[PDB]
């Protein structure tokens, strides 16, 4: 078994650098599109 270059696990995983008790989230693509306001006024 030899590792190929195209995956090449350079680093620890987040779960094993932070413990299995904390949470880790990788949010890099948002919900709730730009048209939808945050305050959502009286209408």
């Amino acid at each position: 078994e030899v590792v190929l270059h195209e995956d090449k696990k350079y680093y620890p995983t987040a779960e094993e650098v932070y413990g299995p008790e904390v949470e880790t989230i990788v949010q890099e693509e948002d919900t709730q599109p730009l048209t939808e306001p945050i305050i959502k006024p009286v209408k």
Partner: protein, 320 residues
């Protein structure tokens, strides 16, 4: 056997329970709603983005800064947030439409910190050149330029009771301003190294300032040296205080020290890890803010990560 040895009150410890990994750039300033629902951040990704405070998801990422975002705050009285960054720009992001509406102008260099007056609708901003400005919201007109420092003005907070405005600068001094006349009331020369964070309490008086030497603590009318705090000896960036007297100092080498307001007792001394990509010497805290509940303490760090902390429900980590 020490003076004020027996009487700090026992605060419970804080622990991580999530990290939030979204930006591509140093996450740099955190604010959170008046209504507890969501929080907001800038970056050096040049993108503000807001996040669900409960589930941690990303609600939307809204952009428009030419360069990094050094400060972001969300107004209580009005339904719009304000932003400021090193593109010399200070913006009024309307929240009912997610778009810029005021776009303040006049700073001759980069823009570091901003803060809202909690009662009347002005806005006090601090820059790199030497000055701080009183922007009049609704007119986007500089009421005052607070020209009294000699170097960069790293942070500014403001309140309702006199003295109004507190500017801690990179020329090692604090000074306390008159909002009406514009002249400074009282400058505070201490802190061999520069002051970069002040915070106010918000129950009683007595604000506190942050610097690499000797985080100190003051008292609002005239300014009065109440106390200095212990040897948290990095080049600290943030101070935040909870309504039950706990106080977090966040620094540039990753270390963040919990305290209490009452005594000055260094409580927890927590130092977090980096998330896998970052090198070991890149941990550092740029923002920290409690919740409106003040059950959650959430810090924006140099590891392009928001770390969210909570209490711990034990009793036996008792005071020495």
């Amino acid at each position: 056997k020490a003076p004020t040895m027996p009487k700090p009150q026992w605060h419970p410890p804080w622990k991580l329970y999530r990290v939030i990994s979204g930006h591509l750039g140093w996450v740099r300033c955190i604010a959170v709603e008046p209504g507890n629902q969501w929080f907001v951040t800038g970056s050096a990704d040049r993108t503000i983005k807001i996040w669900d405070l409960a589930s941690g998801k990303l609600k939307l990422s809204l952009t428009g800064h030419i360069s990094t975002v050094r400060g972001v705050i969300v107004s209580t009285r009005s339904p719009y947030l304000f932003s400021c960054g090193e593109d010399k720009q200070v913006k009024c992001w309307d929240l009912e439409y997610n778009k810029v509406i005021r776009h303040y102008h006049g700073h001759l260099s980069a823009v570091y910190g901003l803060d809202l007056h909690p009662t009347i609708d002005v806005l006090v901003t601090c820059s790199r050149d030497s000055t701080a400005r009183i922007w009049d919201v609704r007119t986007k007109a500089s009421v005052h330029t607070l020209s009294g420092h000699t170097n960069a003005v790293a942070t500014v907070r403001c309140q309702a009771a006199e003295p109004q405005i507190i500017t801690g600068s990179h020329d090692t001094t604090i000074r306390l301003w008159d909002l009406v006349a514009g002249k400074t009331r009282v400058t505070l020369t201490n802190h061999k190294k520069s002051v970069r964070a002040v915070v106010l309490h918000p129950r009683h008086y007595t604000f506190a300032s942050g610097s690499p030497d000797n985080i100190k603590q003051w008292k609002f009318p005239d300014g009065s040296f109440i106390q200095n705090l212990s040897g948290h000896n990095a080049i600290i960036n943030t101070l935040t205080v909870n309504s039950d007297g706990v106080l977090v100092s966040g620094a540039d080498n990753g270390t963040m020290h919990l305290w209490d307001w009452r005594t000055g007792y260094n409580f927890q001394r927590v130092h977090a890890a980096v998330q896998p990509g970052s090198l070991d010497s890149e941990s550092g805290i740029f923002a920290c803010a409690f919740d409106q509940s003040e059950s959650r303490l959430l810090t924006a760090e140099a590891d392009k990560t928001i770390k969210v902390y909570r209490e711990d429900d034990t009793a036996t980590e008792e005071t020495h």
